[PDB]
Amino acid sequence: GSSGSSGKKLCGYLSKFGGKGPIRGWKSRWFFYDERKCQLYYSRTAQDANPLDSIDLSSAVFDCKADAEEGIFEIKTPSRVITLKAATKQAMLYWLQQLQMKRWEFHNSPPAPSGPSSG
């Protein structure tokens, strides 16, 4: 079944592009997924327990920029399209794939509980 170590949450430092600010550019922001509301929360630093904002992945679509060669991606949501980039090209791949697991799963999850479980 399972072994090794527990607590393999999904977290990591990403760079947010110009958005909701006076100027444009990338900024080192701390991003971390939440297993409570199934949303992606991010703050200034890992010490800032208080998440600056959150993005519902349930209805979010991750995409790769034209210059992905460096490792850039974008999360398109029905609320606000965010633009985050990873360390390298192989970095984002991990986020895009993982991020999905959370969402994709919810979709796979079975219907209302208390099923028949007969036979």
Curated annotation (Swiss-Prot):
* Free-text tissue specificity from the UniProt record: Expressed in a broad range of tissues, especially in kidney, liver, lung and placenta. Also expressed in keratinocytes and epithelia-containing organs. Isoform 2 is differentially expressed in prostate normal and cancer cells (at protein level).
Domain spans labelled PH: 8-104
Q: Which domain of life is it from?
A: Eukaryota
Region of interest (Interaction with CADH1), residue spans: 8-113
Q: Where in the cell is it found?
A: Cytoplasm; Cytoplasmic vesicle; Cell junction
**Which residue spans traverse the membrane?**
none
What other comment is given for this protein?
A: 'Armus' means hinge, linker in Latin and ancient Greek.
Q: How does it assemble?
A: Interacts with activated RAC1 and CDH1.
Q: Briefly state the protein's biological role.
A: Acts as a GTPase-activating protein for RAB7A. Signal effector acting as a linker between RAC1 and RAB7A, leading to RAB7A inactivation and subsequent inhibition of cadherin degradation and reduced cell-cell adhesion.
Name of the protein: TBC1 domain family member 2A
- The residues of the intact protein that this chain contains are 46 to 151 of 928
